[PDB]
Amino acid sequence: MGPVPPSTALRELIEELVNITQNQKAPLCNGSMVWSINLTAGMYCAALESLINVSGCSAIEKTQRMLSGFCPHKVSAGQFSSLHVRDTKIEVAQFVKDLLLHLKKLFREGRFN
Protein backbone atom coordinates (compact mmCIF):
# COMPACT_ATOMS: atom_id res chain seq x y z
CA MET A 1 0.00 0.00 0.00
CA GLY A 2 1.42 3.43 -0.93
CA PRO A 3 1.75 6.23 1.69
CA VAL A 4 -1.41 8.06 2.85
CA PRO A 5 -2.47 10.64 0.15
CA PRO A 6 -2.33 14.38 1.08
CA SER A 7 -6.10 15.01 1.25
CA THR A 8 -6.51 11.84 3.35
CA ALA A 9 -3.77 12.97 5.77
CA LEU A 10 -5.52 16.34 6.25
CA ARG A 11 -8.86 14.67 7.08
CA GLU A 12 -7.02 12.35 9.47
CA LEU A 13 -5.28 15.38 11.02
CA ILE A 14 -8.48 17.45 11.28
CA GLU A 15 -10.50 14.59 12.85
CA GLU A 16 -7.78 13.79 15.41
CA LEU A 17 -7.21 17.45 16.37
CA VAL A 18 -10.97 18.00 16.81
CA ASN A 19 -11.34 14.83 18.92
CA ILE A 20 -8.71 15.94 21.50
CA THR A 21 -10.00 19.58 21.77
CA GLN A 22 -13.74 18.77 21.82
CA ASN A 23 -13.44 16.52 24.92
CA GLN A 24 -10.84 18.75 26.63
CA LYS A 25 -12.16 20.20 29.91
CA ALA A 26 -9.08 22.43 30.38
CA PRO A 27 -5.95 23.27 28.32
CA LEU A 28 -4.08 20.03 27.50
CA CYS A 29 -0.73 21.59 28.49
CA ASN A 30 -0.08 23.30 31.84
CA GLY A 31 -1.64 26.41 30.28
CA SER A 32 1.41 26.68 28.00
CA MET A 33 1.02 29.52 25.45
CA VAL A 34 2.62 29.70 21.96
CA TRP A 35 3.66 32.57 19.67
CA SER A 36 1.01 33.61 17.13
CA ILE A 37 1.98 33.03 13.47
CA ASN A 38 0.73 34.33 10.12
CA LEU A 39 -1.38 31.63 8.43
CA THR A 40 0.14 31.36 4.93
CA ALA A 41 1.10 28.54 2.48
CA GLY A 42 3.88 27.68 5.01
CA MET A 43 1.39 27.12 7.88
CA TYR A 44 2.78 23.64 8.68
CA CYS A 45 6.38 24.91 8.84
CA ALA A 46 5.49 28.06 10.81
CA ALA A 47 3.05 26.23 13.12
CA LEU A 48 5.63 23.50 13.81
CA GLU A 49 8.35 25.91 15.09
CA SER A 50 5.85 27.63 17.41
CA LEU A 51 4.95 24.23 18.90
CA ILE A 52 8.65 23.28 19.27
CA ASN A 53 8.38 25.71 22.21
CA VAL A 54 5.92 23.37 24.01
CA SER A 55 7.63 20.37 25.70
CA GLY A 56 6.30 17.68 28.09
CA CYS A 57 2.88 17.65 26.36
CA SER A 58 2.39 14.09 25.02
CA ALA A 59 -1.10 14.92 23.69
CA ILE A 60 0.62 17.00 20.93
CA GLU A 61 3.57 14.68 20.19
CA LYS A 62 1.43 12.90 17.59
CA THR A 63 0.39 16.32 16.27
CA GLN A 64 4.09 17.17 15.93
CA ARG A 65 4.69 14.01 13.86
CA MET A 66 1.69 14.67 11.58
CA LEU A 67 2.66 18.35 11.12
CA SER A 68 6.21 17.30 10.17
CA GLY A 69 4.75 15.04 7.47
CA PHE A 70 3.55 18.29 5.83
CA CYS A 71 6.78 20.25 6.57
CA PRO A 72 10.20 18.42 6.49
CA HIS A 73 11.44 21.34 8.64
CA LYS A 74 13.79 20.03 11.35
CA VAL A 75 13.50 23.00 13.75
CA SER A 76 15.50 23.00 17.02
CA ALA A 77 14.48 24.83 20.22
CA GLY A 78 17.32 27.20 19.18
CA GLN A 79 16.45 27.77 15.48
CA PHE A 80 13.40 30.00 14.80
CA SER A 81 11.88 31.18 11.47
CA SER A 82 8.42 32.80 12.03
CA LEU A 83 8.98 34.11 15.59
CA HIS A 84 10.72 37.14 14.01
CA VAL A 85 7.88 39.58 14.76
CA ARG A 86 7.41 40.55 18.43
CA ASP A 87 3.76 39.44 18.67
CA THR A 88 2.10 38.33 21.92
CA LYS A 89 1.76 34.66 22.97
CA ILE A 90 -1.65 32.89 23.01
CA GLU A 91 -3.07 29.79 24.73
CA VAL A 92 -2.36 26.55 22.82
CA ALA A 93 -6.09 25.69 22.90
CA GLN A 94 -6.79 28.89 20.92
CA PHE A 95 -3.79 28.24 18.66
CA VAL A 96 -5.23 24.91 17.49
CA LYS A 97 -8.69 26.45 16.97
CA ASP A 98 -7.29 29.32 14.86
CA LEU A 99 -5.27 26.79 12.85
CA LEU A 100 -8.39 24.58 12.51
CA LEU A 101 -10.17 27.20 10.35
CA HIS A 102 -7.29 27.13 7.84
CA LEU A 103 -6.95 23.30 7.82
CA LYS A 104 -10.49 22.65 6.54
CA LYS A 105 -10.12 25.76 4.33
CA LEU A 106 -7.40 24.25 2.07
CA PHE A 107 -9.62 21.16 1.75
CA ARG A 108 -12.20 23.21 -0.17
CA GLU A 109 -9.53 24.19 -2.75
CA GLY A 110 -7.91 20.72 -2.58
CA ARG A 111 -4.54 22.57 -2.50
CA PHE A 112 -2.64 20.79 0.30
CA ASN A 113 0.84 21.80 1.52
Side-chain angles (χ1 to χ4, degrees):
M1 290 187 296
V4 297
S7 61
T8 300
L10 186 75
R11 290 175 55 165
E12 289 180 350
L13 179 61
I14 292 172
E15 290 181 85
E16 189 68 20
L17 290 173
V18 171
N19 286 141
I20 56 172
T21 54
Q22 287 289 309
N23 299 132
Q24 76 86 47
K25 184 173 80 175
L28 300 171
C29 289
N30 290 339
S32 293
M33 306 210 299
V34 284
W35 296 90
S36 67
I37 59 165
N38 293 145
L39 288 294
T40 61
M43 310 196 300
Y44 297 90
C45 283
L48 180 59
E49 48 173 309
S50 294
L51 290 174
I52 287 300
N53 290 333
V54 190
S55 296
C57 289
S58 185
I60 61 172
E61 282 171 0
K62 290 279 189 75
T63 300
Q64 290 290 288
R65 182 243 304 300
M66 290 191 284
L67 290 172
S68 291
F70 282 91
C71 254
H73 224 261
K74 290 180 180 166
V75 177
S76 163
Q79 290 180 41
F80 293 103
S81 286
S82 193
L83 277 66
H84 295 3
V85 300
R86 292 181 293 164
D87 290 342
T88 65
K89 295 180 82 171
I90 54 170
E91 296 180 359
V92 170
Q94 184 180 38
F95 175 95
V96 177
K97 290 180 180 70
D98 290 339
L99 180 63
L100 180 59
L101 290 306
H102 281 262
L103 294 175
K104 53 180 180 160
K105 184 179 180 58
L106 279 300
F107 181 75
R108 290 180 63 164
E109 300 181 351
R111 294 180 200 305
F112 308 94
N113 177 236

